[PDB]
Structure 1
Amino acid sequence: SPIEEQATRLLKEVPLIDGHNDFPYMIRGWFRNDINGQDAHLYDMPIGQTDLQRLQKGLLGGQFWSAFVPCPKNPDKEVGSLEALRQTLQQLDVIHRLIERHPTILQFADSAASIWSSFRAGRVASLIGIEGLHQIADSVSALRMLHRLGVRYVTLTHNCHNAFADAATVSPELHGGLSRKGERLIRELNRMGMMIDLSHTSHEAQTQALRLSRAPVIYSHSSIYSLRAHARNVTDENLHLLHRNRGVVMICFLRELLASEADQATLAHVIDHIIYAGTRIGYEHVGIGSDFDGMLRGPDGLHDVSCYPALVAGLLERGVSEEDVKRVMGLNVIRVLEEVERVAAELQGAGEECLCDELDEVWNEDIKEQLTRERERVRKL
């Protein structure tokens, strides 16, 4: 078919960059992050919607791999919070080892230039994001070290309220959007060059974050509220504020977010959602955010990572222009990452002060007096 030829050409010209895939958590579930002598299975998985053969088959140009850990359940809240931090480092570790063990297929990327260079070399540009601020254990220092390990977006919440923001699917509300900590964290995320992700957050938290942020944000895996009413989907109000923000809504393949009866969800519904957003806030503010391996089953025609050429062909069949399809595929999320990094560079260049953690006093006045007395003795020498 001419359109299947056309779709194949587009996937080779520009990278399709998917906003969210939980394949690293499947590796934790199935292998317990032990991939030594498991290439046969990593290429052909006995579970899930992602493996390295099907990843090549679907012609995916890049991927934000999710370093998700569950919301802490432990009765003792300090343990659970600190446990989530250790589990995050385990998930970042297995993502890096997955990329390093398969350098013909996957190449690490943390920027627009690194995405392109990976795509020129014929590899999947492998970026990283964390799904929730519960993962940092209330530590902005830890968050900067996660950025240093290659994390390029942070979902403000998952399916639990944290000290910074409200999740969508939990009632009652705790902060009613963002807390004062949350607001102050928006400035720090903009300063460090961390891309803000508004998936899983409440409608009020989205509205506040979109007004406050000095850099463009994303929805790594969310759909449209008007087509299908759900707490996880984006309202027409927040879609317009996303336009002012210059952000991108990366459309989700979650069946619950596409249709009222989950088993009726299809590829055509995903295309309806992309076109709705593209019509109302322009095709330069829409993306693709599958959420593959964050679900058991996908929509009809989007069952796994091999199905991306059908999505590209489907968009072209509906009269979306080549140039707009290239934007939806990946050019838009590349622009947001580039603008997030430009805003961070110009804020850092202006000498903006970084957010610091609240630390305990390690020394009492006796120890501090010994230290000052010792210093003055050295000054006399």
Structure 2
Amino acid sequence: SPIEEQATRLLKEVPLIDGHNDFPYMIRGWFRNDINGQDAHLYDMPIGQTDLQRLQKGLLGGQFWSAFVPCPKNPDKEVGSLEALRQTLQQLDVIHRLIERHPTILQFADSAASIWSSFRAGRVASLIGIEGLHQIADSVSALRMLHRLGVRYVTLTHNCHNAFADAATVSPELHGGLSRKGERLIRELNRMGMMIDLSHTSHEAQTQALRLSRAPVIYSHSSIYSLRAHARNVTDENLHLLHRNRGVVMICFLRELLASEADQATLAHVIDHIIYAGTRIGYEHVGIGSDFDGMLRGPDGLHDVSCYPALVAGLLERGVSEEDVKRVMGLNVIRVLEEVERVAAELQGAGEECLCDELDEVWNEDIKEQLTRERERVRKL
């Protein structure tokens, strides 16, 4: 069809960059992060919605691979929080090993330039994000090291309240949006060049983050509230504040977020959600945030990662212009990552102070007096 050829041409011209995929957690579930001699299975998986053959088939240009670990369930709160940090490094490790063992398909990217150079070579631009602040174990130092390991967005919560912000799906509220720590962390995230992700966060937490953030944010996988009322979806209030923020809402394929009955959800519903946001806040603030492998089953026509050409063709069929489809595919999320890095460079160039952790005193006054006495002895030599 001339529409199918058009969709294939667009997928070759610009990268379709998906906002969120939990394929790394499926590798932890199925293989337990042991991928040695598992290429046959990694190319043709016996479970899930993602594998390396189907990833090629769908012509996907880039991917933010999620490094999610569950919210801590342990009665010992210190152990659970610290356990999440160790599991985070295990998931970042298997993501890096997955990319490194398959260099013909996947290539690591952590910027707008690295996404393009990956797309020119014919690879899937492989970026990384974490699904929740619980993953850092209350350590802003750890968060900066996660940025150094290649993490380029941080979802503020998953399905649990943390010290920084409230989750959408948990009641009662803890902070009523962001905490004081949360407000201060927004400045640090803008300073370091970490992209803020407002998926899974409460409506009040979104409103406060959108007003405070000096850089554009994203919703890595969230849908529209007006079309389907759910705690996880974005309200018209927050859609307008996203426009002022210059952020992007990357539309989710979760069936619960598209229809009241999950079995009724379809590819057409995803297109309705993209067109709604594109009509009201412009097509330069809308994206694609599948959440593949964060669900058992997908919508009719969006069953797995091979179905992206159907989404591009469906948007063109509805009268969304080529230029606007290219924006929704990936140009918008590239711009936000580019603007996040530019803001960080401005703030780092200006010499803004970084947020430091609260640490225990290791030395008492006796030790500090010995050290000062010792220094003075060396001065008199």
TM-score range, shorter chain: over 0.9
Measure, in 2, the Cα distance between the counterparts of 1:296 and 1:174.
30
- 1:141 is matched with 141
Q: Structure 1, residues 187-241: CA drift from partner, whole Å, max 9, x if none?
A: 0000000000000000000000000000000000000000000000000000000
Runs (4+) of structure 1 moved beyond 6 Å? none
Shift of 1:341: 0.1
Q: Structure 1, residues 101-157: CA drift from partner, whole Å, max 9, x if none?
A: 000000000000000000000000000000000000000000000000000000000
Shift of 1:160: 0.1
Identical-residue share of aligned pairs (%): 100
Shift of 1:281: 0.1
Measure, in 2, the Cα distance between the counterparts of 1:207 and 1:352.
25
Secondary structure of 2:154 counterpart: strand
Measure, in 2, the Cα distance between the counterparts of 1:273 and 1:247.
16
- 2:231 is matched with 231
- 1:176 is matched with 176
2:313 pairs with 1:313:
yes
Shift of 1:178: 0.1
Q: Structure 1, residues 273-320: CA drift from partner, whole Å, max 9, x if none?
A: 000000000000000000000000000000000000000000000000
Shift of 1:4: 0.2
- 1:209 is matched with 209
Q: Structure 1, residues 41-64: CA drift from partner, whole Å, max 9, x if none?
A: 000000000000000000000000
- 1:33 is matched with 33
Q: Structure 1, residues 309-343: CA drift from partner, whole Å, max 9, x if none?
A: 00000000000000000000000000000000000
- The count of corresponding residues between Structure 1 and Structure 2 is 381
Measure, in 2, the Cα distance between the counterparts of 1:134 and 1:349.
30
- 1:327 is matched with 327
Q: Structure 1, residues 63-105: CA drift from partner, whole Å, max 9, x if none?
A: 0000000000000000000000000000000000000000000
Please provide the CA RMSD for this pair.
Answer: 0.1
Q: Structure 1, residues 341-381: CA drift from partner, whole Å, max 9, x if none?
A: 00000000000000000000000000000000000000000
Secondary structure of 1:129 counterpart: strand
Shift of 1:6: 0.2
Measure, in 1, the Cα distance between the counterparts of 2:202 and 2:268.
27
Secondary structure of 2:88 counterpart: helix
Secondary structure of 1:19 counterpart: strand
Secondary structure of 2:9 counterpart: helix
Measure, in 1, the Cα distance between the counterparts of 2:263 and 2:162.
32
Secondary structure of 2:135 counterpart: helix
2:369 pairs with 1:343:
no
* Structure 2 residue runs without a partner (length 5+): none
Measure, in 1, the Cα distance between the counterparts of 2:176 and 2:297.
33
- 2:110 is matched with 110
Shift of 1:37: 0.1
Q: Structure 1, residues 8-53: CA drift from partner, whole Å, max 9, x if none?
A: 0000000000000000000000000000000000000000000000
Secondary structure of 1:152 counterpart: strand
Shift of 1:246: 0.0
Measure, in 1, the Cα distance between the counterparts of 2:228 and 2:269.
10
Measure, in 2, the Cα distance between the counterparts of 1:114 and 1:138.
30
Measure, in 2, the Cα distance between the counterparts of 1:263 and 1:237.
29
2:378 pairs with 1:378:
yes
Measure, in 2, the Cα distance between the counterparts of 1:199 and 1:12.
29
1:65-84 aligned at under 5 Å gives the runs 65-84=65-84
Measure, in 2, the Cα distance between the counterparts of 1:95 and 1:355.
28
Secondary structure of 1:64 counterpart: strand
* Structure 1 residue runs without a partner (length 5+): none
Shift of 1:244: 0.0
Secondary structure of 2:48 counterpart: coil
Measure, in 2, the Cα distance between the counterparts of 1:299 and 1:166.
29
1:58-69 aligned at under 5 Å gives the runs 58-69=58-69
Measure, in 2, the Cα distance between the counterparts of 1:49 and 1:68.
17
Measure, in 1, the Cα distance between the counterparts of 2:78 and 2:341.
33
Q: Structure 1, residues 252-283: CA drift from partner, whole Å, max 9, x if none?
A: 00000000000000000000000000000000
- 1:195 is matched with 195
